[PDB]
Design a binder for this molecule. Structure first.
Ligand SMILES: Cc1ncc(COP(=O)(O)O)c(CNc2co[nH]c2=O)c1O
Ligand SMILES: Cc1ncc(COP(=O)(O)O)c(CNc2co[nH]c2=O)c1O
Ligand SMILES: [Cl-]
Ligand SMILES: [Cl-]
Lengths: 359, 359
């Protein structure tokens, strides 16, 4: 059998180099980095190299933190509940601006903050599937504690104007957080350009293991820990380090940014090839503005055949995709031209077959 | 070189079987268990087998949850901040009883809860290094939201009277949590016998990978999520599943409980052998009641030579241990009689050498 995987927004394959690099820390380098003895101190260099890779990936500076979390959900929960106690309660700034497009980690958390009597403005999506810089400026009260806008959307692949929203936040004196989960490895990410105070990411979206992520925290910005216990991560996030996944995620970031031109040049092209071809088969419109997107994602619709049906079919013929209904096909650098061609074929045949049962 | 590792309370070696079982999920079974397509659904059986192993390890029932967390720190933080909102605030039960002996994940969290105006009673340690059932009963007000007592202590290896504290909590109508991190794999753990509502554990203490743990939650007990986003873990703890570490931790628990008689019979004996022998070298008393302890841990003192000095020495001769000052030597099933003998030798020679520089 030979399966085609087009579900990169759900999760990605761990890069083989990433599997290789982690392996020694699952075998004989099993010491707790906190121990003083050799089993501990021996892990120190690989961890430092990892952190370094993470800093360079997002343009963090020495004076910033990139804190290791267990996933972007942790990161996101952490930013929101941290600001809740540091701003919303202790400083009266009882308002948070976000968008409707946000991942549930952000949205549900906000929902919880609402239940305690935080006022949350969920900026509405426009016709383009976007949010504009002016939209958040027009929403900032001076009780606004935080603006949280996702860098790129995982439904459509839509990029939002982070840089611009950054500027507004700087001018207005408001904490800015960007969930960048869907941007790492897909387009360049720059916390300096973004004037982010907080950035979250998750490794499994860029060929690292599931079960680890990061939160960038700008110099001098405070954020009450979500994991108290104050050992690890200059006391900001406690718990014995996930040594293998750290070493791994590090490598994952490095490879991810090394592939940034491949992503735009080749992956993007494969995505255009797929999209263009899908657009033929009679009555198939694409969803969203097709300019401001990460290179890897396309969301096609099939006229009067719910997505689920197309996908269940595609699954049977060994092509994995998901909805966003519409059909979300999302690529990685591990897709090939052959696989796309095949997808065009099997997609169209599937379309055909389902039209005919519809009669 | 041939190193001896006696720092099992810091962390343990991933069991080779555990490394084997996780491996396929780092290689080709990389699908998100939430996907509907084959890459997702194919992970379903291994995950179910894992969870099953976890349930049986602690005697959880079908009607309970064993929720997968990123570590015991997550678990502990989760219980405390969960009860804070569900009991302390929403129900006025503004008091928590714990002990002084607790791991910092519990203690620091409590410290934070104090800062919001929760009243926390930190039960004092006695001469035995213990806490008695009566001590917590005498502390329960009817504003008490939660009792949190650690099952076994990682400093001395001291077991606390969980079963008894359980009974008191049941009688008194109070939520009971036990951090069992230092008990899994060391003595039998039984949430039913314990009348725990909440139990935490962490895999790296029983030959699983760092970076994953569990919280047992009793049937019908509520606990507001620490990770909102409400996808995974019947919405109790959100974030893409750490598939490999889950499969791994599962195996780790199984092997851990399979070795329960080996642990008491052989590991315990090795520990007694080591202890007895150390007790000779002139002026070396052991620390704590030497009856109510997990089999693997001994905490010896050397008269007027701070622990750190003994350890730095021991490190040079390739024996890894830590303080608790006193010297904490903690064993696993991977220690051998040879290694202990060697330790007796090198320990005593080290004692000798440091006496003579002391002059
Ligand atoms: C933009 C974004 N934010 C946060 C997360 C959560 O990261 P995690 O904590 O590692 O799970 C994801 C991935 N989540 C999903 C992508 O597709 N379905 C999902 O549930 C994401 O795409
Ligand atoms: C009793 C207990 N509770 C909680 C933890 C925290 O588990 P983690 O979240 O997986 O780190 C540990 C391990 N911690 C340590 C054992 O020795 N030094 C330690 O810091 C522990 O022994
Ligand atoms: Cl918090
Ligand atoms: Cl919470």
């Amino acid at each position: 059998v030979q399966r085609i995987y087009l579900d990169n927004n759900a999760t990605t394959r761990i890069d083989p180099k990433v599997k290789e690099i982690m392996d020694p820390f699952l075998r004989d380098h099993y010491g707790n980095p906190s121990s003083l003895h050799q089993f501990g101190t021996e892990t120190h260099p690989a961890i430092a190299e990892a952190l370094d890779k993470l800093y360079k990936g997002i343009n963090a500076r020495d004076i910033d933190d990139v804190i290791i979390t267990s996933c972007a959900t942790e990161s996101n929960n952490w930013v929101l509940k941290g600001v809740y106690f540091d701003e919303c309660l202790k400083k009266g700034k009882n308002h948070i601006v976000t968008t409707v497009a946000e991942h549930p980690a952000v949205r549900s958390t906000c929902n919880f903050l609402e239940s305690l009597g935080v006022e949350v403005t969920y900026l509405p999506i426009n016709e383009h599937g976007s949010i504009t810089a002016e939209q958040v400026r027009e929403a900032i009260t001076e009780k606004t504690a935080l603006v949280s806008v996702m860098w790129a959307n995982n439904e459509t692949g839509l990029i939002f104007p982070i840089e611009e929203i950054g500027a507004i936040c700087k001018e207005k004196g408001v904490l800015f957080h960007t969930d960048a989960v869907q941007a790492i490895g897909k387009i360049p990410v720059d916390v300096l350009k973004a004037n982010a105070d907080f950035l979250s990411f998750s490794a499994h979206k860029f060929h690292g293991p599931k079960g680890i992520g990061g939160l960038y925290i700008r110099s001098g910005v405070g954020l009450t820990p979500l994991f108290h216990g104050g050992e690890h991560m200059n006391g900001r996030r406690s718990g014995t380090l996930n040594v293998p996944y750290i070493v791994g995620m590090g490598e994952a970031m490095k490879l991810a940014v090394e592939h940034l031109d491949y992503e735009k040049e080749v992956v993007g092209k494969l995505r255009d090839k797929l999209e263009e071809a899908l657009l033929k088969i009679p009555d198939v419109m694409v969803v969203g503005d097709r300019i401001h997107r990460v290179p890897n994602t396309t969301l096609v619709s099939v006229r009067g055949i719910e997505g689920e049906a197309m996908l269940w079919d595609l699954n049977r013929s060994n092509i994995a995709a998901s909805t966003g209904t519409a059909i979300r096909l999302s690529l990685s650098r591990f897709n090939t031209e052959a696989e796309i061609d095949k997808t065009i074929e099997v997609f169209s045949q599937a379309a055909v077959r389902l039209r005919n049962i519809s009669s």
